[PDB]
Ligand binder design. Structure first.
Ligand SMILES: [Cl-]
Ligand SMILES: [Cl-]
Ligand SMILES: [Mg+2]
Lengths: 161, 164, 164
């Protein structure tokens, strides 16, 4: 999982990639892990719930509908995720506490930073197929991320034998 | 560190907010002040006239229709705004002389830098309600700007705790 | 690297200019050169064929239609262009190997990085007028690029062409 997205894409042409239109807010720019999808819209109740779970080196892919109106994740939630073992969080939307996010040694990608907090109701769906920028994000897939963007693979890269 | 867009957003749910989708070109990443508005399109004679007015504790929000064709503010106006005391300028549009803007100790946000200068016929409106990226910006509101974005309050923070 | 896009824009009002909406991936954000154009869609065989020629202080302007699905340029080709003397490559589309690109001392502007390499079927148009962000880019023109944006002139400034 330490190969580059560019090199692995070359080996796995069928693997779906996403351009780096996200800003790297976290301490780690390169990260990877089994994906877990979440779809919401200006409400992060489910985001907090899911990250409180055990990370186990997985990557949370949040699809906030690309909205920049509210932040789906902040410093507090970022630190929790890190203490829970998550490799990283990818947000198709906004986040906040830019200064605090940079301190957390995990992957944190988002379209932009935005002031307001999201609502805390709980609308949204977990572990469901996603569609971000014309690409399918499927539960159980392995996400790879670096400076050149993201790569979703059906199985972690190998090389052992 | 001091006031923040985020904290104050929590304390003031009625405030309007804009994501940090502007590039920071000024010497100050963080600034705030009483809002002064302006609407123009590829013409900045009004920008020069208004920034010449005393801007102590104020923030000029320039709605350029989002155009990136011409610059509404260059090195000269940036320095002028500073000499006149402006706390900052927010441009929904473009600016130029980025190397010079960076050296002026005022806040300066814009969508992008561009080479061409703006016309100077003087078309535009002063201190009128603006609608930027879905958010209404009003002359007389208080603006806060930092790395997390822009917060617009109907008036500055009211001491209902000890200050904010 | 020399003459500023802002100063020359003032001097040559008729010239065409583009805002700095590109990310500077190369080791030099300032560069200039005679323009060579190319319009392709997620295919980079022609881009490779072109940059494999003597660069001689020219700038290649690739119009990938703005797509960010595949990279029109990688590290090997970027370094190749550099060794061929190309002054820089402007890509209205995406590139990859950003880590390697930062190490290539020529202009390398693009909208974004993306993992997928492009197809190599070789389709596209070489040295034809281009239409990037409402501005026309003509092959033969002289391009200047810096932090303030891109300026296209009919001939190099009153300097000595090649680099400004
Ligand atoms: Cl100016
Ligand atoms: Cl440079
Ligand atoms: Mg009151």
């Amino acid at each position: 999982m330490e190969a580059r997205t560019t090199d692995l894409s070359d080996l796995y042409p069928e693997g779906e990639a996403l351009p780096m239109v996200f800003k790297s807010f976290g301490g780690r720019a390169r990260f990877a892990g089994r994906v877990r999808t979440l779809r919401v819209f200006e409400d992060n109740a489910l985001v907090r719930k899911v990250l409180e779970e055990e990370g186990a080196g997985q990557v949370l892919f949040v699809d906030g509908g690309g909205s920049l109106r509210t932040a789906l994740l902040g410093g507090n939630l970022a630190r929790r995720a890190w203490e829970k073992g998550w490799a990283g969080v990818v947000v198709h939307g906004a986040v906040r506490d830019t200064e605090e996010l940079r301190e957390v040694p995990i992957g944190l990608l988002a379209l932009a930073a935005t002031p307001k907090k999201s609502a805390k109701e709980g609308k949204g769906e977990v572990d469901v197929p996603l569609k971000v920028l014309g690409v399918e994000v499927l539960p159980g897939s392995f996400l790879l991320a670096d400076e050149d963007g993201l790569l979703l693979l059906p199985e972690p890269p190998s090389g052992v034998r």
